[PDB]
Design a protein around this ligand. Structure first.
Ligand SMILES: O=[N+]([O-])c1ccc(O[C@H]2O[C@H](CO)[C@H](O)[C@H](O)[C@H]2O)cc1
Length: 453
């Protein structure tokens, strides 16, 4: 039994954790372009460089978390530090409207990077608590839905309430409203950190005496344990492919809603229905993973978005008008993404257990470093592939193109995510082994091996 209290406290921790970044991810473009007034090229270059640099930084944070011998634990201290420092840096991030000229181009450039690193400090260790809470298949299956559901809910309520709050509190001074809302986020986020730190207790931590973890390891060694843990490498590839495809699809949606108005008030309906789908499929995930195989659910996680892509491909070939097609594609995609995230967290935990099984080392921090690194690098790589595709199609001037050229660009933008999803499902079914009796073997081997000295 995982104490219902620990489940709920981890859920609220995840809520506060993703409620502090959803605003950034979603409206930092709007803030920096519509409020601060910075060139879109500057913002894009900064975002891409920062994602690459944060992805490079992630394994560094994993090494840091692994080598930290502390009282609270090897995770909670960095969780607290990252939470507080990232709260401060988020407030500073959205306080950019105050400065002007180079002074703010530096400010914006200095805060943003600091916002990305700081979050890493708390992001890697937080999820590293999943493997230490339990080692059982079904207990993980019923543990992770709580945090994933709460994170998704944070994202959607952010989308719903952030603009109303800014308009009501600040009005003309939209930047003041943004930073006041940041304060709301900080309150929820710090309270969530306190809750998770107090009520979540580590059982199978690498800082316990019976575990096989070695604190005094090098950065070369740790990053090599990604390659040695073939299952973690397979997870890296799969998650990178899934993230690249999901980022391409989300960019398509951003263009087809922001630039192409489509129909008025289609985006609110789409967002509401898609959030319902996401949160519901997260709520029923234990029942589904009992009824259907975990493998079936991963296959579905990749396939359902592919069905969305195919449907809206058909819409591209025909008239791009059906709102039902759009909202149904969103529903399918959100079901898939929820399944993916739940299964991915469980799979990172399974990979740390398999690392102890094979290499005789327990490193949670590195597996979740791979998770976050892949989140950043998927966006970066999706940008790279999109730029390659657009340059190949002849959009590299970005001045004016044939309508047929634009439609073919849409077609390719649709097919590419499908290729990446096929990559992830193919790689999962060809190389991944931690799903069945192997999971039980690793669990029993670890429990039996957990005998002092
Ligand atoms: O498609 N998006 O815009 C998008 C949504 C959520 C997100 O956050 C996830 O990746 C983070 C990595 O820093 C944290 O692991 C966090 O816990 C995850 O929920 C990242 C991007």
């Amino acid at each position: 039994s995982i104490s219902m209290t620990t489940k709920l406290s981890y859920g609220f921790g995840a809520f506060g954790k993703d409620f502090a970044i959803g605003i950034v991810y979603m409206y930092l473009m709007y803030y920096y372009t519509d409020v601060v007034g910075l060139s879109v090229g500057l913002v894009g270059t900064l975002f891409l460089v920062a994602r690459i640099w944060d992805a490079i930084n992630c394994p560094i944070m994993g090494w840091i978390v692994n080598a930290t011998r502390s009282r609270w634990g090897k995770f909670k201290p960095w969780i607290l530090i990252g939470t507080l420092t990232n709260s401060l840096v988020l407030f500073l991030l959205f306080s950019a409207h105050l400065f002007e000229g180079t002074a703010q181009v530096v400010f914006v450039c200095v805060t943003y990077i600091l916002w990305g690193m700081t979050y890493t400090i708390m992001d890697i260790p937080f999820w590293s608590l999943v493997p230490t809470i339990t080692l059982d298949k079904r207990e993980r299956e019923q543990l992770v839905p709580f945090p994933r559901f709460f994170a998704s809910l944070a994202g959607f309520v952010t989308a719903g309430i952030t603009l109303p709050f800014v308009s009501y509190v600040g009005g003309a001074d939209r930047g003041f409203g943004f930073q006041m809302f940041t304060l709301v986020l900080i309150a929820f986020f710090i309270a969530s950190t306190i809750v998770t730190l107090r009520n979540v207790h580590e059982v199978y931590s690498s800082d316990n005496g019976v575990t096989a973890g070695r604190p005094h390891l090098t950065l070369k060694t740790i990053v090599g344990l990604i390659y040695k843990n073939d299952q973690l490498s397979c997870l890296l590839g799969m998650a990178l492919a899934y993230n690249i495809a999901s980022n391409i699809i989300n960019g398509f949606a951003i263009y087809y809603f922001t630039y192409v108005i489509g129909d008025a008030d289609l985006f609110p309906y789409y967002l509401s229905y898609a959030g319902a789908a996401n949160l519901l499929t997260l709520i029923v995930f234990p029942r589904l993973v009992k009824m259907l195989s975990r493998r079936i659910l991963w296959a579905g996680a990749s396939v359902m978005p592919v069905l969305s892509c195919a449907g809206l491909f058909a819409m591209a070939l025909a008239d791009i008008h059906n709102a039902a097609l759009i909202v149904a594609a969103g529903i399918f995609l959100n079901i898939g993404t929820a399944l993916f995230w739940v299964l991915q967290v469980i799979m990172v935990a399974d990979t740390v257990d398999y690392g102890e099984f094979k290499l005789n080392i327990r490193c949670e921090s590195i597996a979740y470093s791979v998770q976050t690194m892949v989140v950043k690098g998927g966006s970066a790589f999706a940008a790279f592939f999109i730029a390659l595709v657009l340059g190949l199609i002849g959009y590299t001037p970005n001045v004016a193109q044939s309508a047929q050229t634009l439609q073919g660009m849409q077609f390719i933008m649709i097919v590419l995510p499908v290729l990446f999803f096929m990559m992830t499902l193919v790689l999962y079914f060809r190389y991944y082994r931690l799903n069945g009796d192997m999971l039980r073997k690793i669990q029993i081997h670890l429990l039996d091996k957990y005998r002092k000295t």
